[PDB]
Design an enzyme around this catalytic site. Structure first.
Site, PDB file in Angstrom:
ATOM      1  N   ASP A 181       0.896  -1.312  -0.263  1.00 48.79           N
ATOM      2  CA  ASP A 181      -0.143   0.026   0.002  1.00 48.79           C
ATOM      3  C   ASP A 181       0.951   1.263   0.197  1.00 48.79           C
ATOM      4  O   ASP A 181       0.369   2.305  -0.756  1.00 48.79           O
ATOM      5  CB  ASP A 181      -0.996   0.078   1.341  1.00 48.79           C
ATOM      6  CG  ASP A 181      -2.387  -0.523   1.211  1.00 48.79           C
ATOM      7  OD1 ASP A 181      -2.606  -1.314   0.135  1.00 48.79           O
ATOM      8  OD2 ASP A 181      -3.166  -0.492   2.162  1.00 48.79           O
ATOM      9  N   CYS A 215      -2.340   0.663 -13.448  1.00 53.53           N
ATOM     10  CA  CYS A 215      -2.557   0.739 -11.963  1.00 53.53           C
ATOM     11  C   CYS A 215      -3.758   1.792 -11.718  1.00 53.53           C
ATOM     12  O   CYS A 215      -4.853   1.467 -12.327  1.00 53.53           O
ATOM     13  CB  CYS A 215      -1.088   1.115 -11.389  1.00 53.53           C
ATOM     14  SG  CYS A 215      -0.284   2.650 -12.052  1.00 53.53           S
ATOM     15  N   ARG A 221       3.516   2.876 -10.917  1.00 53.05           N
ATOM     16  CA  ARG A 221       3.561   1.348 -11.258  1.00 53.05           C
ATOM     17  C   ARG A 221       3.800   0.653 -12.573  1.00 53.05           C
ATOM     18  O   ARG A 221       4.666   0.131 -13.121  1.00 53.05           O
ATOM     19  CB  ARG A 221       2.643   0.315 -10.304  1.00 53.05           C
ATOM     20  CG  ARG A 221       2.775   0.596  -8.765  1.00 53.05           C
ATOM     21  CD  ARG A 221       1.685  -0.320  -8.072  1.00 53.05           C
ATOM     22  NE  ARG A 221       1.483   0.418  -6.868  1.00 53.05           N
ATOM     23  CZ  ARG A 221       0.402   0.094  -6.148  1.00 53.05           C
ATOM     24  NH1 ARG A 221      -0.349  -0.944  -6.400  1.00 53.05           N
ATOM     25  NH2 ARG A 221       0.201   0.777  -4.719  1.00 53.05           N
ATOM     26  N   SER A 222       2.663   1.250 -13.574  1.00 51.23           N
ATOM     27  CA  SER A 222       2.832   0.883 -14.794  1.00 51.23           C
ATOM     28  C   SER A 222       3.843   1.459 -15.685  1.00 51.23           C
ATOM     29  O   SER A 222       4.609   0.798 -16.539  1.00 51.23           O
ATOM     30  CB  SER A 222       1.453   1.639 -15.439  1.00 51.23           C
ATOM     31  OG  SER A 222       0.269   1.280 -14.951  1.00 51.23           O
ATOM     32  N   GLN A 262       6.819   7.850 -10.532  1.00 50.70           N
ATOM     33  CA  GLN A 262       5.952   9.018  -9.545  1.00 50.70           C
ATOM     34  C   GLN A 262       6.800   9.757  -8.403  1.00 50.70           C
ATOM     35  O   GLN A 262       6.376  10.918  -7.919  1.00 50.70           O
ATOM     36  CB  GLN A 262       4.695   8.432  -9.051  1.00 50.70           C
ATOM     37  CG  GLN A 262       3.493   8.757 -10.040  1.00 50.70           C
ATOM     38  CD  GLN A 262       2.267   7.941  -9.615  1.00 50.70           C
ATOM     39  OE1 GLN A 262       2.105   6.860  -9.355  1.00 50.70           O
ATOM     40  NE2 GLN A 262       1.091   9.006  -9.199  1.00 50.70           N
TER      41      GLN A 262
END
Length: 284
Positions: A181, A215, A221-222, A262
């Protein structure tokens, strides 16, 4: 510079935040006028994440052709990817229309439906064989054929039917279920194993349309997934693998979608994944 030495240099000097901000400063800025039209406000999950006009995927319908999705075309590596947000309640039919129209074989999902106690994307695929889904706005039917649950990921076989023509196609759903998370994984081993399972299926190969990867926003994440895949392929293809520059590859990808990677932690994790993955590519 051998990225493994570049890595230790940055790590010892603790300058990851500085490196990452340089990337943010040098990244492309192209218009995203269609994403910002008032009629598309409920088609975007986040106000500050939009596809560029020049690389956006267009739906094949005269009404409204907009979806929050981008085509990332890597010319030297000979790979293409579609990066998109997690579907919203009002865009699940658009999502499967895009998969159909772009002739994709695989969908790669890097988030859970709920994370941090909040919904990160719609439940857009069926959970039981005998309870299929129908998307009336785009005239598609989606059935669960089989499910293989492993410790770090799940792979599903799905049947997508174009109800207008009664053609059917098999779609593979690759669901990485253990990204934490908060933060990034401690080791890249399970993420790399997952990437190799996607490769082995054919879903990344030129005989099919581009893989769809998402994502929640379709940039963090992508971005890590496509950056690692492309860098490892370039190390396979070139005479001098130490010539592959991960920062240069990331800036090339950012010509096609804003914001890929990010955080400085995601940038470090991408380096780590490529360094550890290369110890198979090369010959070990």
């Amino acid at each position: 510079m051998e990225m493994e030495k570049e890595f230790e240099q940055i790590d010892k000097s603790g300058s990851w935040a500085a490196i990452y901000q340089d990337i943010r400063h040098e990244a492309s800025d192209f218009p995203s006028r269609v994403a910002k039209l008032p009629k598309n406000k409920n088609r975007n999950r986040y106000r500050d994440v939009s596809p560029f006009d020049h690389s956006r995927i267009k739906l094949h319908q005269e009404d409204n052709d907009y979806i929050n999705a981008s085509l990332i075309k890597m010319e030297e590596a000979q790979r293409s990817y579609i990066l998109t947000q997690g579907p919203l309640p009002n865009t699940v039919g658009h999502f499967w229309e895009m998969v159909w129209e772009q002739k994709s074989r695989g969908v790669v999902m890097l988030n859970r439906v709920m994370e941090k106690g909040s919904l990160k994307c719609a439940q857009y695929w069926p959970q039981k064989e005998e309870k299929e889904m129908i998307f009336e706005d785009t005239n598609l039917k989606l059935t669960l054929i089989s499910e293989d649950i492993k410790s770090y990921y799940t792979v599903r076989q799905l049947e997508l039917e174009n109800l207008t023509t009664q053609e059917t196609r098999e779609i593979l759903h690759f669901h990485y279920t253990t990204w934490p998370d908060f933060g990034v994984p401690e080791s890249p081993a399970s993420f790399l194993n997952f990437l190799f399972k996607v490769r082995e299926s054919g879903s990344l190969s030129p005989e099919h349309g581009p893989v769809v990867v998402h994502c929640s926003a379709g940039i963090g994440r992508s971005g890590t997934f496509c950056l690692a895949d492309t860098c490892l392929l370039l190390m396979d293809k070139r005479k001098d693998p130490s010539s592959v520059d991960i920062k240069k590859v990331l800036l090339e990808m950012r010509k096609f979608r804003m914001g890929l990677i990010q955080t400085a932690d995601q940038l470090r994790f991408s380096y780590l994944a490529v360094i550890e993955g290369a110890k198979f590519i090369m010959g070990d």
